[PDB]
Each structure stands twice: as structure tokens, then as C-alpha cells.
């Protein structure tokens, strides 16, 4: 009764709307999908995870191709700084003639989007300003698009097959596979950020073409070899030298001491050309650490069963984890979002704190744009990163292949991590938040005089030793003559001081009071967007409520009245809740920043300092003020150029909102109703001869919590989204 679609009988014979949810939804679930040998999925992912490598590559061969059409770089070369950084060209056949009064913007001639993807600098940096010398990165990320779908087509063929073994092998996929993966990758890069960028920063149509008959460094390729180098660091490109130009263009190559010069406002070129050309050896040792064949280099193994120390004249005894991290893929999606977790957040300031190109530190639109983004994945990667962290538990782990060693133990003593990551918060519960409220009482009841704002004393130490010389406190180092800042008083440590503090530097920002009032708050968030996780994950191994969700799985929709003492219970629906409090914990640390930062770009830095230490401050003049440019580019006259979020925003402000019905409005109210008229339209003539291919039902309770989540967040990714941009194109 209904044979189609596929993967399993189960839901493919099933006769309601589900199928289509429960096709589409659970559609990369194959690793428990009745159709899969020990290869099949391992087999699968491969082509699969090329596959997109395809579009990522057609992500940009376009949008590269896209520009030079569109926008005005070959133009914008004549003068580089205003601006309304230029995105795409908008064929929207609904826009009222005021398309002029619409987006006749930048170089336009058409209602173009205001680009914020940063990139336009990341491309200016590598090399080009000649879009006739673009047209090509396009054609290149096509030279990679078709090319690599043969890695598709082809190495998805038993012949030039894969294996499985080949996949579990550890010391090759890794050891060998640092050396290539990163390593070499840089060099040429590390060198292109050396030998094709320099000659324009010197100023010279170096191109490809003239590709040897340059020789941008005078003394050929000698001292590299030999054992003598500093005829390189020799005369840095110099002091005023209008950037990528004439005068002060002090030839050199591989530099590593100067940094910025106000003008670029941004880490100066080919002085990270030595950077990328060093990291290298730091895997190219630990990079031939192990193997391919050859009988020399590492096993791992007694790395453990010996090296379980640090541990053991008691303790934990590892006798191998391994046949777990290598058998249990998850881990390979346990820790490859898990740790490309962090990176996201340690890219979430390096990238800003000191930029990397054609002016951003004073754009206040990437920062805005190219930040939060790079943050929300430090969300949407950092989160759902322990999810594949329950999994192995109820769906890879065997308590017996392991119950010697840490994990099972971790476990044995688990109902602890839970309850100290908890006391970690109820506290970061009342405080950072009790205090915080007469910092909102008084400030109301004419009494700011008295006030509990306790000013951070600690971060405080840092940010000075690491250079920063801004008022008070007679200690060493940054003394601007000090004995950690000596023995090394020249290496690394004039320049990274030469810019250390006046803010068009943003470098190590100007620490205010209540600075920790969010900072604390952000060491609340986390400790309480874990535990969720490290239950929704941890004890979500089984529990004792239903000491067998082990069978049950990860993604079981709630429970029903079962002995009044059960409900929403997926370790999944703890990731659900987990993705709430995390967007809460981003909820916050994007207020700060916007408050802060915003402050500066119009001088007024009482936009904090004065305020936040009592939240209407946030509400009033972080939240209330600045706006109605956006929400008055709509405003019963017209639209001008900030028109959109004035729409998008209320979008986010709708498309949020109704991730609510699904949410507050649970399950067996929908069927019941959607019967009482799934029925009405089954009676009423004329539109009687219409019996419908399958049969309308309401929605699995999971879903009815999922699309609560992707109307929501989608809404919520929206707005702040459009606001953070809107805002700034009025005010900066």
C-alpha cells in the first residue's frame, strides 16, 4: 500500500505526508538505514563530501565571475575607501520606479546590493586590482568544479574504488596527512603571499606571464640555501610609502618586524609571507611523525596503554581508546566540528583584532558583517558538536570494548560534570546578575551615586604586558622598558607596541567597567549551554527514567503520559534546548561589540562606559536609539537605500514569532482539527471528484519542535542580521 519512495520499507510504504517530511528530513541519516554495508556509508560520504566541494567551488567561481561585471573594481582602482562595498545586481521586477530612489548606489546603474563579505580585500591582498586579470579565478574555481566531480563521478566507481580499511588506517590519513593537507599548501601560498603580490605593492604588472624575468629579490635564490638570510628582512617597505605604490617602496621580501603603518591600517604585506613559511615545519615535525610503510615512526597505541600517564599508580588505565575514535566515525564529526569549533572563535577576533587587508579596522561594516557570522558557526559548529557526542554512546560505544579507560570512567563518575557545571551557573545565576539589578534599581530611583558596578581587576594584567601602555600602575615589562619586554626588546616588540592603544587600532580594546558585566554573563552562558549538551549527550546514554534510550536512540519524539513523569526526551531534544541557550549565549556577546565598537566609530564612547551596568542602557541606547533610520527608510514617504531590513527586519520580526505555534502549540490539537475539515472538503460537491494522493496528517512532535527551529533562528539569524547592517550606512 504505497511502495515508493526508497531507503527502507518502513516509511516508504507509510501513507501520510510523513514520507515527505520523513523522506526529506532524515535524508542524510544513512548510517542506520537498512541498505548499507560496512562500506556503503563510508563509500557514500566520499563522493558526498567531495560533491559539495563542487559548489563551494561554484560558490565563488561565480561571485568572483559575478564581480567585474558588476561591480566597479577595475573602476574602484582610481580611489579605494568610501564606500558602499558592492554585491550583485538585483533583477526584482516588483521594485517601484524609485529604483533610482531605490539603489542607484555606488557604481551601479542598477539597484545593486551593498556588499559586506569582506573578501573584496582578501581579494586585493593576494594580488589583483585588474578584473581583466579576474575573469580567471572564476575559470579557476571551475578548473576546480568539474575536475573534482570526477573525484565524484569516478572515484565513486568500484575499479578505482575506495576500501574501508584504507579509511580506518590512522597513521596515513593524518600523519602523512598533515604534511600535505596544510604544509606545502602554504609554501606556494606562503610564497604567493611573497612573489606575486610584492611586485604591485612595489607596483609592477608582474602577472603570471613575466614569471621568472622578474626576480623581485635582487640576490636570486642564494642565501635561502647557504645559511644567511637577513639580506631579506633588509629594508622593510617603508614608513610612508603610499601603499602598493611609489616612494618608500622598500624592496626586501620575507619580512617579520614592522606591522600596519596607519595607511593600510592592516597587517603589512609579505610580513606574513614569513608566517606562512614557518608554521609548516611545525607539522613537518609531528608530520613525518608516523608512517607510510617504511618501519620508522609512529603507532600511537602505547602512546596510550603505556602513555595513559599523566596518570596511574592508580587512576584510569587507557589500555587503548582508539578502536572507538577510529571505529566510531562520530569523533570524525565528534571533533571535526568540535575543534574547528574553537578555531571559529579564535578566528572571531584574530581577523579583526588585527585585520589582514585593504582596510577594514576602520570600515565598521565588516566587523558588523564578516564577524558575527564567523561567530554564529562558532555557534552552529561549536554547538551540535557534542550531539555527535552523545551518538557514539547509544550508537557506537560498547561499555566493554572500553570499561577499563577514562570514558567509561568519565561515565562511571559522570553525574558530577553535570552538577559542577550547574553550580557553575546558579551563581553566574544570581550574581553577575543580582548586583546587576540595582544597577537598574538605583538607576531609576535617582541614586547612581551609590551603585554596585564592581570594576574588573583581572583581565587587566594582560593587554599591558602584551604591550599596552595606558595609564597608572607602576609595574614592569610594558614599562616601555621592562624585563619580559627585554631579552627580546626589538624582536616582535616595538611595532606591536607602535600601534597598541588609541583605538583606530582596536588592538586589545580599551577595557571599561561592566566590561565583565557582559564578560561574566558570557562566562555564565556557556556553563548552561553545556550541561544541556552534557546531558543531552552524557547521561543521555541511558538515564534511569528510561534506562534504555540506549536502545531507543537519539531521536525519539517525546513520550506520552507514561506514568506522569516523562517528556521530551530525545538526547536530540536536549540538543534542542541546547541550541536555545547558545543562541542566548550569542544572544548576548553580539550586543557587546555593537555596543562597544559602535561607540568609537562616531567618537562617542559613553555609548558604553557611561551606560551599561544597568540594562535599559542596553535597551535605551544600545537597543532603542540609532535605529529608525532603518525603520524610517520606509516611513510613509519612501524607501531610500535602507528600505530592505525595514522589511527584512519585520521579517525576522515575523519569521521569528511563528516559530511559535509549532513550539507552544503541541501535537494532538492539529490532527483532530485537521480531521474536522479533512472531511469538510470530502462531502462538498463540485470540488468532490478530488480524492488526493496521500492523506493529510499533523506533525510528528519532533518537527513540531524542529521547524519551531528554522523559522525561529532563521528569523533570529535574521534582523540583528539586517539591523547590524542597517544602522551602519546611516550612523557609523
Amino acid at each position: 500500500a504505497l511502495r515508493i519512495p526508497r531507503f527502507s520499507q518502513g516509511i516508504a510504504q507509510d501513507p501520510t505526508t510523513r514520507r515527505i517530511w520523513f523522506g526529506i528530513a532524515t535524508a542524510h541519516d544513512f548510517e542506520s538505514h537498512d541498505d548499507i554495508t560496512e562500506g556503503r556509508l563510508y563509500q557514500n560520504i566520499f563522493a558526498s563530501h567531495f560533491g559539495q566541494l563542487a559548489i563551494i567551488f561554484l560558490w565563488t567561481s561565480g561571485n568572483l565571475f559575478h564581480v567585474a561585471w558588476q561591480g566597479n573594481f577595475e573602476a574602484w582602482v582610481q580611489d579605494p575607501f568610501h564606500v558602499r562595498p558592492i554585491a550583485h545586481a538585483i533583477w526584482d521586477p516588483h521594485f517601484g520606479q524609485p529604483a533610482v530612489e531605490a539603489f542607484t548606489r555606488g557604481g551601479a546603474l542598477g539597484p545593486v546590493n551593498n556588499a559586506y563579505s569582506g573578501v573584496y580585500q582578501w581579494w586585493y591582498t593576494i594580488g589583483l586590482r585588474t578584473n581583466e586579470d579576474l575573469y580567471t579565478g572564476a575559470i579557476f574555481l571551475l578548473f576546480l568544479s568539474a575536475i573534482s566531480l570526477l573525484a565524484g563521478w569516478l572515484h565513486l566507481q568500484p575499479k578505482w574504488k575506495p576500501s574501508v580499511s584504507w579509511f580506518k588506517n590512522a597513521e596515513s590519513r593524518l600523519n602523512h596527512h598533515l604534511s600535505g593537507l596544510f604544509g606545502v599548501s602554504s609554501l606556494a601560498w606562503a610564497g604567493h603571499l611573497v612573489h606575486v603580490a610584492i611586485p604591485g605593492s612595489r607596483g609592477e604588472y608582474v602577472r603570471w606571464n613575466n614569471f621568472l624575468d622578474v626576480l623581485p629579490y635582487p640576490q636570486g635564490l642564494g642565501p635561502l640555501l647557504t645559511g644567511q638570510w637577513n639580506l631579506y628582512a633588509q629594508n622593510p617597505s617603508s614608513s610612508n610609502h603610499l601603499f602598493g605604490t611609489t616612494q618608500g617602496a622598500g624592496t626586501a621580501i620575507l619580512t617579520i618586524l614592522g606591522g600596519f603603518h596607519p595607511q593600510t591600517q592592516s597587517l603589512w604585506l609579505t610580513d606574513v609571507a614569513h608566517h606562512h613559511l614557518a608554521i609548516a615545519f611545525l607539522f613537518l615535525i609531528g608530520g613525518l611523525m608516523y608512517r607510510t610503510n617504511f618501519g620508522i615512526g609512529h603507532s600511537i597505541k602505547y602512546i596510550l596503554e603505556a602513555h595513559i600517564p599523566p596518570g596511574g599508580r592508580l587512576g584510569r588505565g587507557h589500555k587503548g581508546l582508539y578502536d572507538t575514535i577510529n571505529n566510531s566515525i562520530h569523533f570524525q564529526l565528534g571533533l571535526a566540528l568540535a575543534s574547528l569549533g574553537v578555531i571559529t572563535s579564535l578566528v572571531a577576533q584574530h581577523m579583526y583584532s588585527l585585520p589582514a587587508y585593504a582596510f577594514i579596522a576602520q570600515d565598521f561594516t565588516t566587523q558588523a558583517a564578516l564577524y558575527t557570522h564567523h561567530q554564529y558557526i562558532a555557534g552552529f559548529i561549536m554547538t551540535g558538536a557534542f550531539a555527535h557526542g552523545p551518538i557514539f554512546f547509544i550508537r557506537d560505544y560498547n561499555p566493554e570494548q572500553n570499561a577499563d579507560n577514562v570514558l567509561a570512567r568519565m561515565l562511571e563518575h559522570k553525574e558530577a560534570i553535570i552538577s559542577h557545571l550547574s553550580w557553575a551557573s546558579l551563581f553566574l545565576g544570581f550574581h553577575t546578575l543580582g548586583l546587576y539589578v540595582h544597577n537598574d534599581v538605583m538607576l531609576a530611583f535617582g541614586t547612581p551615586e551609590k551603585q554596585i558596578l564592581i570594576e574588573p581587576i583581572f583581565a587587566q594584567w594582560i593587554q599591558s604586558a602584551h604591550g599596552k601602555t595606558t595609564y597608572g600602575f607602576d609595574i614592569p615589562l610594558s614599562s616601555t622598558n621592562g624585563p619580559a619586554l627585554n631579552a627580546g626588546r626589538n624582536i616582535w616588540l616595538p611595532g606591536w607596541l607602535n600601534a597598541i592603544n588609541e583605538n583606530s587600532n582596536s588592538l586589545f580594546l580599551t577595557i571599561g567597567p561592566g566590561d565583565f558585566l557582559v564578560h561574566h554573563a558570557i562566562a555564565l552562558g556557556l556553563h548552561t549551554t553545556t550541561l544541556i549538551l552534557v546531558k543531552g549527550a552524557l547521561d543521555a546514554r541511558g538515564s534511569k527514567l528510561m534506562p534504555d534510550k540506549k536502545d531507543f536512540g537519539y531521536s525519539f519524539p517525546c513520550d506520552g503520559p507514561g506514568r506522569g513523569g516523562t517528556c521530551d526526551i530525545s538526547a536530540w531534544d536536549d540538543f534542542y534546548l541546547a541550541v536555545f541557550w547558545m543562541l542566548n549565549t550569542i544572544g548576548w556577546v553580539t550586543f557587546y561589540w555593537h555596543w562597544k565598537h559602535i561607540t568609537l566609530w562616531r567618537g562617542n564612547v559613553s555609548q558604553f562606559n557611561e551606560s551599561s551596568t544597568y540594562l535599559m542602557g542596553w535597551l535605551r541606547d544600545y537597543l532603542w536609539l540609532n535605529s529608525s533610520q532603518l525603520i524610517n527608510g520606509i516611513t510613509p514617504l519612501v524607501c531610500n537605500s535602507l528600505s530592505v531590513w525595514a522589511w527584512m527586519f519585520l521579517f525576522g520580526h515575523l519569521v521569528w514569532a511563528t516559530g511559535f505555534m509549532f513550539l507552544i502549540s503541541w501535537r494532538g490539537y492539529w490532527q483532530e482539527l485537521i480531521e474536522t475539515l479533512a472531511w469538510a472538503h470530502e462531502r462538498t460537491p463540485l470540488a468532490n471528484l478530488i480524492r488526493w494522493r496521500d492523506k493529510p496528517v499533523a506533525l510528528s512532535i519532533v518537527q513540531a519542535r524542529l521547524v519551531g527551529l528554522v523559522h525561529f533562528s532563521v528569523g533570529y539569524i535574521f534582523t540583528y542580521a539586517a539591523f547590524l547592517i542597517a544602522s551602519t550606512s546611516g550612523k557609523f
Binding site: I4, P5, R19, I20, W91, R693, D694
Partner: peptide, 30 residues
């Protein structure tokens, strides 16, 4: 001759998905 590329947008929005909600109408009756 010249004026366009609209060619694309009345597709990508107008017929293309008109053909998405058309041929996987389906997935079911694919």
C-alpha cells in the same frame, strides 16, 4: 541582439521551481 540577462530570474524563480514543485510532485510520484 541585446538587453537582459533577465533570461535567468523568470527561471530561477518562475519556471524552475514551477518545475521543482512539478517533477518531485512527486518525489512521491517523482
Amino acid at each position: 541582439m541585446i538587453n537582459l540577462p533577465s533570461l535567468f530570474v523568470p527561471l530561477v524563480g518562475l519556471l524552475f521551481p514551477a518545475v521543482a514543485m512539478a517533477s518531485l510532485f512527486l518525489h512521491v510520484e517523482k
